Amino acid sequence: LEAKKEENLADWYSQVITKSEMIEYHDISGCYILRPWAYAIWEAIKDFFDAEIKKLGVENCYFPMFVSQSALEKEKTHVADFAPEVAWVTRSGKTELAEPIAIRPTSETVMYPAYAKWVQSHRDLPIKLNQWCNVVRWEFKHPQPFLRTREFLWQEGHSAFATMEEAAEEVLQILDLYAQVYEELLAIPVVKGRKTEKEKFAGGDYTTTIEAFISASGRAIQGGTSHHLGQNFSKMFEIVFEDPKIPGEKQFAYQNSWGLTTRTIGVMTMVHGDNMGLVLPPRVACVQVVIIPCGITEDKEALIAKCNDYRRRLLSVNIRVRADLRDNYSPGWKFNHWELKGVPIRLEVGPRDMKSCQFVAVRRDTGEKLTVAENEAETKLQAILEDIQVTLFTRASEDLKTHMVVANTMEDFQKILDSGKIVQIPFCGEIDCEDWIKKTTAMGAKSLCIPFKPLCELQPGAKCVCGKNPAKYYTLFGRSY
Amino acid sequence: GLEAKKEENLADWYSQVITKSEMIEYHDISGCYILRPWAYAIWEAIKDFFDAEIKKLGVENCYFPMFVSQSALEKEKTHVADFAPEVAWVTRSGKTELAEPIAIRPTSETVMYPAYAKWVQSHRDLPIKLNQWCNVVRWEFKHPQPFLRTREFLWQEGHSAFATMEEAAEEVLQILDLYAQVYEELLAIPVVKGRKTEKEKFAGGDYTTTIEAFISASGRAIQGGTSHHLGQNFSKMFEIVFEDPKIPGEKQFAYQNSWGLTTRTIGVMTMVHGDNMGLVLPPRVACVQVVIIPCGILSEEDKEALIAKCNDYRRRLLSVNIRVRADLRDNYSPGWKFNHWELKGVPIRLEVGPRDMKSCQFVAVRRDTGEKLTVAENEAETKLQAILEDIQVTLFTRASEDLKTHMVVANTMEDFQKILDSGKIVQIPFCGEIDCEDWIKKTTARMGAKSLCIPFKPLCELQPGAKCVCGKNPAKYYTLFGRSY
Ligand SMILES: Cc1ccccc1CNC(=O)c1nccnc1NCc1ccccc1C
Ligand SMILES: Cc1ccccc1CNC(=O)c1nccnc1NCc1ccccc1C
Ligand code: PRO
Ligand code: PRO
Ligand SMILES: [Sr+2]
Ligand SMILES: [Sr+2]
Ligand SMILES: [Sr+2]
Ligand SMILES: [Sr+2]
Ligand SMILES: [Sr+2]
Ligand SMILES: [Sr+2]
Ligand SMILES: [Zn+2]
Ligand SMILES: [Zn+2]
């Protein structure tokens, strides 16, 4: 690895995702190849998230990718902010189609016409559906793998309820699931809050989000969204049901939508990566422990059989293990090779170590070498793997606890912002006031989220940073990624 | 209920079954359809089986971009010219025309193999075995059918690259056998293995092996999956070269394969095993093998014990890994739940009446035969298990017999069209020419019979010196002919 993280971060990120065999560059700008090393992280998120949403009653399905030109113009506010971001298919071959067809930037306009046919009574509720698919967002910003891409994989769960109470209860349920994915699988602490009126989902009531922080660039990034659509989309697609007790009364449905993309892997690379390469948390690592024979220079057949000893012993306790037993490369090459890929534990077996009933476990995060007896293999490695997961989170929590501050004035909010930090400021919550913030912070700082539990309680009567309107709440501000 | 009959109008019967079973919902755009969770669970059941089998062969999962460039598609010329009229093109961002239209993938050959060239440099960089589960757009202007003939479908596509051609030719038949296991062991659908003719083969590749199924209701056959050996025709155009391990400087081209399996599997399952009373699911891919339905609806205290007895059955059937659901919904009638789960094709319906609860009795109803057999509260773990395996074999026996009745052999063009108009598929001696294959489709329609596959094990060996049905060229093999979807 030639680039450093504190110096050239952009070139460091490109070398890390490629040398770790996670990302391969295509030739259409905005598209990237998810190699099996990075795809195994996405499946680990799928098998965890799917097991949680199916407890809540959500069922997986799949909807068409194509949207007709008439279906996109059904919800006016939904097509406003999405019009410049949508890609249209106008012909197949050299034959122009009947009507231009769009690729889905989101499946709200595709499913809700079907929700209207399925919802006809109170018994046909609640509907809870989810799908793992791909979407196209034709944005004119600089693409970066995982983080910002035109095409990306995600999940989108759409749920219609008969009451606003049960709909509001699922919004916070899904948002806390997204928090578990970042904190308990990726070891990334995030801040849960609400979006402002300018950066909320178009055509919806309110948007909840989780904001992760990257100390290498001093920028924050949104990791997931969970919107409460209210009756906005159900009033335009005629998603109504009959009241169970009152005869003849028909009430509109209350709908929610929530999503989580593959930038979860990107934030993991940005938060835990170092100048030695990738760093995978043991919870999502494709290979947790790699076994490498050392000191090879004819008693070698026993050393290989002893590496196969640790390999099968770790498989029975259900620990993802890989045995690199290639004779083409030196043990020093394998050390560099698997450190770039982020394998949490390196299991070194030497000739004298084998005959001594001991081995060496090297931690990817700290580089510490711990000699472990042969009998304690399954139990000590299970303890170090759990310790690496927490260590990556505590160190990430320390960088988030110290880079998030409070500022009540504009110049002190401006000063701390240029020091690579995100700030919570008393904010009035107006669009015309937020545009001025991004105009004077310059690249300019945008709103991140209105945190549920802010760092400090807002003083009653305290004004906003603009000095003209009274402040409504503390809003986390900063530059986005 | 069901407003159509399978023998009367199969087209309307197909629309009623796929929708009333809550599998397919129609989309605003023709040719595109919605995969509801009941149909998606059938595809997920195929996924967990086929994924674990290719994992044992060294294949790893990944995901490639859905957009292909105009330069990469025009590399292999024979491949693009055959796919060109069905390639959806992205030509607009918002209300602005792009300076260079990009295409949506109808297959990921021209997308992955450029990356295969960068990865393959040494001999140890082989073999590369990569698979991906994704959707594919093939915007054909022909008559669309749900599952069977859709413009967008979910599928899997594995792309392998080997150093020697022996391992490549070996894996083609390995994947082809896995496709047969998906249809025979799981879907209980008998398939015939064979190679595709030069007309129906994969353009730009070497040879194409495929599986074929028969639908007795329409008398038409259908392709269930393909496994193409690409040879070096693709590695030569994308420069996928590896240095020779012994000969210094000399670089060799890699032998490649490609295989795909689509969601058409579900449509073939519904077309073959579906009856006039709804869907019929094989117990292997059954999302719900047995359904507990509390029937008999007075005594609310005993009625609570009836729901309690339902949970005991659902709790005991889980210990034997029998997929069970207890429909304890107090907002639906038991008669509603009967035909509702019958339309979904649940293999067994476990009904429990109040008199049966107070007498060590319960009734199990088979979906394939409709046998209402009363079983005691003792063999609930063994009898239902014996029925589930008896349902799987019975469905496969009816379909394997239907194939033997309608797959015959004819040696003259006269006997060809006669048995073809009887709703059967026929194995004929064929010369293998593209022009002769086009003449067969035109003559047998005056609706045209197409070549299905060249069976590896035909019904009869070609007699030495046999002539084709055309009479102008010697026959090379027996080919399965018949009308197709
Ligand atoms: C901003 C930009 C710049 C250049 C090109 C394209 C794009 C657009 N693409 C995205 O915003 C993006 N890309 C990958 C993964 N997640 C994403 N959204 C993030 C996202 C979207 C929806 C729900 C939840 C989340 C976390
Ligand atoms: C023929 C037609 C008519 C009208 C509109 C569109 C289409 C095209 N549709 C397909 O080719 C299709 N559709 C769904 C499932 N499998 C498919 N191919 C079948 C298939 C392809 C590749 C590998 C394996 C299989 C079994
Ligand atoms: O696009 C979005 O942001 C929401 C969440 C997933 C579905 N729609
Ligand atoms: O499209 C096809 O038919 C082949 C098989 C999967 C990849 N390409
Ligand atoms: Sr009213
Ligand atoms: Sr009302
Ligand atoms: Sr492999
Ligand atoms: Sr040469
Ligand atoms: Sr050569
Ligand atoms: Sr001749
Ligand atoms: Zn203000
Ligand atoms: Zn001929």
mmCIF file of N, CA and C in Angstrom, chain B residues 26-104:
data_model
loop_
_atom_site.group_PDB
_atom_site.id
_atom_site.type_symbol
_atom_site.label_atom_id
_atom_site.label_comp_id
_atom_site.label_asym_id
_atom_site.label_seq_id
_atom_site.Cartn_x
_atom_site.Cartn_y
_atom_site.Cartn_z
ATOM 1 N N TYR B 26 -49.898 -8.420 -12.194
ATOM 2 C CA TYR B 26 -49.602 -7.818 -13.486
ATOM 3 C C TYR B 26 -49.112 -6.386 -13.321
ATOM 4 N N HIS B 27 -48.108 -6.026 -14.114
ATOM 5 C CA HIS B 27 -47.479 -4.716 -14.065
ATOM 6 C C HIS B 27 -48.040 -3.819 -15.165
ATOM 7 N N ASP B 28 -47.757 -2.518 -15.039
ATOM 8 C CA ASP B 28 -48.233 -1.548 -16.020
ATOM 9 C C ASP B 28 -47.694 -1.841 -17.414
ATOM 10 N N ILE B 29 -46.488 -2.394 -17.506
ATOM 11 C CA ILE B 29 -45.833 -2.669 -18.780
ATOM 12 C C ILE B 29 -46.010 -4.143 -19.111
ATOM 13 N N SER B 30 -46.441 -4.426 -20.338
ATOM 14 C CA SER B 30 -46.630 -5.805 -20.763
ATOM 15 C C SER B 30 -45.291 -6.530 -20.822
ATOM 16 N N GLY B 31 -45.307 -7.815 -20.474
ATOM 17 C CA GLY B 31 -44.106 -8.613 -20.402
ATOM 18 C C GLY B 31 -43.398 -8.577 -19.065
ATOM 19 N N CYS B 32 -43.665 -7.567 -18.242
ATOM 20 C CA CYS B 32 -43.105 -7.473 -16.902
ATOM 21 C C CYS B 32 -44.170 -7.849 -15.881
ATOM 22 N N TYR B 33 -43.768 -8.617 -14.870
ATOM 23 C CA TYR B 33 -44.707 -9.135 -13.887
ATOM 24 C C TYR B 33 -44.093 -9.043 -12.497
ATOM 25 N N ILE B 34 -44.951 -9.173 -11.490
ATOM 26 C CA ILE B 34 -44.560 -9.049 -10.091
ATOM 27 C C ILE B 34 -44.431 -10.444 -9.496
ATOM 28 N N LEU B 35 -43.331 -10.685 -8.787
ATOM 29 C CA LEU B 35 -43.091 -11.957 -8.107
ATOM 30 C C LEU B 35 -43.474 -11.787 -6.640
ATOM 31 N N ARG B 36 -44.671 -12.249 -6.292
ATOM 32 C CA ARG B 36 -45.155 -12.152 -4.927
ATOM 33 C C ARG B 36 -44.414 -13.150 -4.035
ATOM 34 N N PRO B 37 -44.434 -12.938 -2.712
ATOM 35 C CA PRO B 37 -43.646 -13.805 -1.815
ATOM 36 C C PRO B 37 -43.926 -15.292 -1.955
ATOM 37 N N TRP B 38 -45.136 -15.682 -2.365
ATOM 38 C CA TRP B 38 -45.423 -17.104 -2.523
ATOM 39 C C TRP B 38 -44.638 -17.697 -3.686
ATOM 40 N N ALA B 39 -44.483 -16.938 -4.772
ATOM 41 C CA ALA B 39 -43.648 -17.385 -5.878
ATOM 42 C C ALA B 39 -42.169 -17.156 -5.600
ATOM 43 N N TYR B 40 -41.838 -16.112 -4.837
ATOM 44 C CA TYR B 40 -40.440 -15.846 -4.516
ATOM 45 C C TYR B 40 -39.873 -16.896 -3.569
ATOM 46 N N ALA B 41 -40.717 -17.480 -2.714
ATOM 47 C CA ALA B 41 -40.255 -18.555 -1.843
ATOM 48 C C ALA B 41 -39.905 -19.806 -2.639
ATOM 49 N N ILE B 42 -40.588 -20.037 -3.761
ATOM 50 C CA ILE B 42 -40.238 -21.159 -4.624
ATOM 51 C C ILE B 42 -38.888 -20.916 -5.287
ATOM 52 N N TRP B 43 -38.618 -19.669 -5.679
ATOM 53 C CA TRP B 43 -37.328 -19.341 -6.277
ATOM 54 C C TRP B 43 -36.216 -19.364 -5.235
ATOM 55 N N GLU B 44 -36.514 -18.926 -4.008
ATOM 56 C CA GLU B 44 -35.532 -19.014 -2.932
ATOM 57 C C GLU B 44 -35.212 -20.461 -2.581
ATOM 58 N N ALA B 45 -36.198 -21.356 -2.681
ATOM 59 C CA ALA B 45 -35.940 -22.770 -2.423
ATOM 60 C C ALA B 45 -35.008 -23.358 -3.473
ATOM 61 N N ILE B 46 -35.169 -22.944 -4.733
ATOM 62 C CA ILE B 46 -34.236 -23.355 -5.775
ATOM 63 C C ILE B 46 -32.863 -22.746 -5.530
ATOM 64 N N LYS B 47 -32.817 -21.547 -4.948
ATOM 65 C CA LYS B 47 -31.543 -20.871 -4.732
ATOM 66 C C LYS B 47 -30.700 -21.601 -3.692
ATOM 67 N N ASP B 48 -31.290 -21.922 -2.536
ATOM 68 C CA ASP B 48 -30.527 -22.579 -1.476
ATOM 69 C C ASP B 48 -29.992 -23.936 -1.916
ATOM 70 N N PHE B 49 -30.673 -24.601 -2.851
ATOM 71 C CA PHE B 49 -30.184 -25.882 -3.347
ATOM 72 C C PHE B 49 -29.057 -25.693 -4.355
ATOM 73 N N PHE B 50 -29.300 -24.896 -5.399
ATOM 74 C CA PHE B 50 -28.307 -24.737 -6.456
ATOM 75 C C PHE B 50 -27.079 -23.974 -5.976
ATOM 76 N N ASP B 51 -27.244 -23.077 -5.001
ATOM 77 C CA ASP B 51 -26.097 -22.336 -4.490
ATOM 78 C C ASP B 51 -25.155 -23.250 -3.715
ATOM 79 N N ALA B 52 -25.707 -24.130 -2.877
ATOM 80 C CA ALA B 52 -24.868 -25.044 -2.110
ATOM 81 C C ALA B 52 -24.164 -26.053 -3.007
ATOM 82 N N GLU B 53 -24.753 -26.375 -4.160
ATOM 83 C CA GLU B 53 -24.135 -27.340 -5.063
ATOM 84 C C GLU B 53 -22.972 -26.727 -5.834
ATOM 85 N N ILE B 54 -23.120 -25.483 -6.296
ATOM 86 C CA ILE B 54 -22.020 -24.831 -6.999
ATOM 87 C C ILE B 54 -20.934 -24.357 -6.042
ATOM 88 N N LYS B 55 -21.266 -24.136 -4.767
ATOM 89 C CA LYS B 55 -20.233 -23.827 -3.784
ATOM 90 C C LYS B 55 -19.280 -24.999 -3.599
ATOM 91 N N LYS B 56 -19.787 -26.229 -3.711
ATOM 92 C CA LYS B 56 -18.944 -27.412 -3.600
ATOM 93 C C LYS B 56 -18.062 -27.625 -4.823
ATOM 94 N N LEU B 57 -18.289 -26.884 -5.905
ATOM 95 C CA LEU B 57 -17.493 -26.999 -7.119
ATOM 96 C C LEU B 57 -16.464 -25.887 -7.262
ATOM 97 N N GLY B 58 -16.335 -25.015 -6.265
ATOM 98 C CA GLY B 58 -15.381 -23.928 -6.317
ATOM 99 C C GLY B 58 -15.909 -22.629 -6.883
ATOM 100 N N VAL B 59 -17.217 -22.508 -7.076
ATOM 101 C CA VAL B 59 -17.815 -21.307 -7.646
ATOM 102 C C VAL B 59 -18.133 -20.332 -6.520
ATOM 103 N N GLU B 60 -17.776 -19.066 -6.720
ATOM 104 C CA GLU B 60 -18.027 -18.009 -5.752
ATOM 105 C C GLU B 60 -19.027 -17.009 -6.318
ATOM 106 N N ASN B 61 -19.853 -16.455 -5.436
ATOM 107 C CA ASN B 61 -20.877 -15.502 -5.838
ATOM 108 C C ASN B 61 -20.326 -14.082 -5.843
ATOM 109 N N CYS B 62 -20.876 -13.261 -6.733
ATOM 110 C CA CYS B 62 -20.461 -11.871 -6.886
ATOM 111 C C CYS B 62 -21.600 -11.110 -7.556
ATOM 112 N N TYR B 63 -21.304 -9.903 -8.034
ATOM 113 C CA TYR B 63 -22.288 -9.108 -8.759
ATOM 114 C C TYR B 63 -21.571 -8.140 -9.686
ATOM 115 N N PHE B 64 -21.987 -8.123 -10.947
ATOM 116 C CA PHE B 64 -21.415 -7.284 -11.986
ATOM 117 C C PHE B 64 -22.385 -6.184 -12.397
ATOM 118 N N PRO B 65 -21.884 -5.090 -12.975
ATOM 119 C CA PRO B 65 -22.777 -4.002 -13.390
ATOM 120 C C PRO B 65 -23.783 -4.460 -14.435
ATOM 121 N N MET B 66 -24.948 -3.814 -14.426
ATOM 122 C CA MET B 66 -26.009 -4.128 -15.371
ATOM 123 C C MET B 66 -25.875 -3.380 -16.691
ATOM 124 N N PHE B 67 -24.940 -2.441 -16.793
ATOM 125 C CA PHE B 67 -24.735 -1.672 -18.011
ATOM 126 C C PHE B 67 -23.509 -2.183 -18.754
ATOM 127 N N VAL B 68 -23.644 -2.325 -20.070
ATOM 128 C CA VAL B 68 -22.559 -2.757 -20.940
ATOM 129 C C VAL B 68 -22.279 -1.647 -21.942
ATOM 130 N N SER B 69 -21.005 -1.451 -22.263
ATOM 131 C CA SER B 69 -20.619 -0.402 -23.191
ATOM 132 C C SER B 69 -20.821 -0.855 -24.634
ATOM 133 N N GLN B 70 -20.923 0.127 -25.533
ATOM 134 C CA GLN B 70 -21.039 -0.170 -26.955
ATOM 135 C C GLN B 70 -19.773 -0.806 -27.517
ATOM 136 N N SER B 71 -18.616 -0.554 -26.901
ATOM 137 C CA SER B 71 -17.371 -1.147 -27.377
ATOM 138 C C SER B 71 -17.242 -2.603 -26.948
ATOM 139 N N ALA B 72 -17.622 -2.917 -25.708
ATOM 140 C CA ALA B 72 -17.467 -4.280 -25.210
ATOM 141 C C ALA B 72 -18.458 -5.238 -25.858
ATOM 142 N N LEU B 73 -19.651 -4.758 -26.219
ATOM 143 C CA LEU B 73 -20.618 -5.634 -26.871
ATOM 144 C C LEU B 73 -20.206 -5.955 -28.301
ATOM 145 N N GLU B 74 -19.529 -5.026 -28.973
ATOM 146 C CA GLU B 74 -19.112 -5.212 -30.355
ATOM 147 C C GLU B 74 -17.789 -5.956 -30.483
ATOM 148 N N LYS B 75 -17.213 -6.423 -29.376
ATOM 149 C CA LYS B 75 -15.993 -7.218 -29.437
ATOM 150 C C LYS B 75 -16.281 -8.552 -30.114
ATOM 151 N N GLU B 76 -17.031 -9.421 -29.440
ATOM 152 C CA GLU B 76 -17.480 -10.675 -30.035
ATOM 153 C C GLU B 76 -18.635 -10.365 -30.979
ATOM 154 N N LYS B 77 -18.380 -10.457 -32.287
ATOM 155 C CA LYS B 77 -19.358 -9.991 -33.266
ATOM 156 C C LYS B 77 -20.523 -10.963 -33.407
ATOM 157 N N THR B 78 -20.253 -12.267 -33.324
ATOM 158 C CA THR B 78 -21.321 -13.247 -33.486
ATOM 159 C C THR B 78 -22.306 -13.204 -32.325
ATOM 160 N N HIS B 79 -21.849 -12.786 -31.143
ATOM 161 C CA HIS B 79 -22.716 -12.761 -29.972
ATOM 162 C C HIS B 79 -23.657 -11.561 -29.985
ATOM 163 N N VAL B 80 -23.162 -10.390 -30.392
ATOM 164 C CA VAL B 80 -23.985 -9.185 -30.346
ATOM 165 C C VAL B 80 -25.051 -9.215 -31.435
ATOM 166 N N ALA B 81 -24.703 -9.712 -32.626
ATOM 167 C CA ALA B 81 -25.648 -9.705 -33.738
ATOM 168 C C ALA B 81 -26.872 -10.563 -33.448
ATOM 169 N N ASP B 82 -26.722 -11.600 -32.622
ATOM 170 C CA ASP B 82 -27.852 -12.446 -32.262
ATOM 171 C C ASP B 82 -28.672 -11.869 -31.116
ATOM 172 N N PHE B 83 -28.065 -11.037 -30.267
ATOM 173 C CA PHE B 83 -28.763 -10.412 -29.152
ATOM 174 C C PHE B 83 -29.188 -8.976 -29.432
ATOM 175 N N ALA B 84 -28.674 -8.360 -30.498
ATOM 176 C CA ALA B 84 -28.919 -6.942 -30.770
ATOM 177 C C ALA B 84 -30.391 -6.541 -30.767
ATOM 178 N N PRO B 85 -31.310 -7.239 -31.447
ATOM 179 C CA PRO B 85 -32.697 -6.747 -31.509
ATOM 180 C C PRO B 85 -33.456 -6.821 -30.192
ATOM 181 N N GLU B 86 -32.858 -7.340 -29.117
ATOM 182 C CA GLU B 86 -33.555 -7.482 -27.843
ATOM 183 C C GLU B 86 -32.765 -6.850 -26.702
ATOM 184 N N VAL B 87 -31.944 -5.851 -27.008
ATOM 185 C CA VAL B 87 -31.115 -5.176 -26.016
ATOM 186 C C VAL B 87 -31.750 -3.829 -25.702
ATOM 187 N N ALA B 88 -32.202 -3.657 -24.462
ATOM 188 C CA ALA B 88 -32.748 -2.376 -24.035
ATOM 189 C C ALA B 88 -31.628 -1.355 -23.873
ATOM 190 N N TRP B 89 -31.862 -0.145 -24.377
ATOM 191 C CA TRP B 89 -30.852 0.904 -24.417
ATOM 192 C C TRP B 89 -31.268 2.072 -23.534
ATOM 193 N N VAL B 90 -30.351 2.520 -22.684
ATOM 194 C CA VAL B 90 -30.555 3.708 -21.862
ATOM 195 C C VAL B 90 -30.053 4.907 -22.659
ATOM 196 N N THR B 91 -30.976 5.770 -23.082
ATOM 197 C CA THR B 91 -30.642 6.886 -23.956
ATOM 198 C C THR B 91 -31.023 8.248 -23.392
ATOM 199 N N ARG B 92 -31.533 8.320 -22.164
ATOM 200 C CA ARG B 92 -32.007 9.589 -21.628
ATOM 201 C C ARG B 92 -31.807 9.642 -20.121
ATOM 202 N N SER B 93 -31.278 10.766 -19.645
ATOM 203 C CA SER B 93 -31.199 11.081 -18.223
ATOM 204 C C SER B 93 -32.125 12.264 -17.974
ATOM 205 N N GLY B 94 -33.271 12.000 -17.351
ATOM 206 C CA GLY B 94 -34.289 13.018 -17.200
ATOM 207 C C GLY B 94 -34.972 13.316 -18.518
ATOM 208 N N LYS B 95 -34.885 14.565 -18.974
ATOM 209 C CA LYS B 95 -35.401 14.965 -20.277
ATOM 210 C C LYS B 95 -34.275 15.334 -21.238
ATOM 211 N N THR B 96 -33.083 14.786 -21.013
ATOM 212 C CA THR B 96 -31.901 15.102 -21.801
ATOM 213 C C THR B 96 -31.359 13.835 -22.443
ATOM 214 N N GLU B 97 -31.097 13.899 -23.745
ATOM 215 C CA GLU B 97 -30.503 12.778 -24.458
ATOM 216 C C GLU B 97 -29.017 12.682 -24.139
ATOM 217 N N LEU B 98 -28.550 11.461 -23.900
ATOM 218 C CA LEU B 98 -27.155 11.240 -23.558
ATOM 219 C C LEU B 98 -26.280 11.262 -24.805
ATOM 220 N N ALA B 99 -25.009 11.617 -24.609
ATOM 221 C CA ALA B 99 -24.056 11.661 -25.711
ATOM 222 C C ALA B 99 -23.597 10.280 -26.151
ATOM 223 N N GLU B 100 -23.987 9.231 -25.435
ATOM 224 C CA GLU B 100 -23.567 7.874 -25.751
ATOM 225 C C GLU B 100 -24.493 6.888 -25.051
ATOM 226 N N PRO B 101 -25.430 6.276 -25.773
ATOM 227 C CA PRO B 101 -26.385 5.371 -25.123
ATOM 228 C C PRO B 101 -25.701 4.119 -24.599
ATOM 229 N N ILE B 102 -26.063 3.736 -23.379
ATOM 230 C CA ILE B 102 -25.561 2.517 -22.760
ATOM 231 C C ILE B 102 -26.683 1.490 -22.743
ATOM 232 N N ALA B 103 -26.300 0.220 -22.723
ATOM 233 C CA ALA B 103 -27.229 -0.882 -22.909
ATOM 234 C C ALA B 103 -27.427 -1.660 -21.615
ATOM 235 N N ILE B 104 -28.626 -2.215 -21.460
ATOM 236 C CA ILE B 104 -28.956 -3.092 -20.344
ATOM 237 C C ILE B 104 -28.623 -4.523 -20.737
#
